[PDB]
Amino acid sequence: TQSHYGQCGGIGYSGPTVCASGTTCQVLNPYYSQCL
Numbered sequence: 660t661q662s663h664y665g666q667c668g669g670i671g672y673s674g675p676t677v678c679a680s681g682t683t684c685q686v687l688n689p690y691y692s693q694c695l
């Protein structure tokens with residue numbers, strides 16, 4: 660699970676894309692997405 664305020668999967672990020680429960684993966688930019 661990706662941490663809170665962490666990048667959860669933009670184009671090119673194939674790591675922890677699944678946010679911790681309670682946090683939502685919000686795509687902010689095409690490559691920048693953050694678990695909030």
Ligand SMILES: *[C@H]1O[C@H](CO)[C@@H](O)[C@H](O)[C@@H]1O
Pocket residue numbers: 661662663664665666
């Ligand atoms: C939360 O923690 C993860 C690693 O555990 C980071 O990838 C993220 O940027 C944030 O610091």
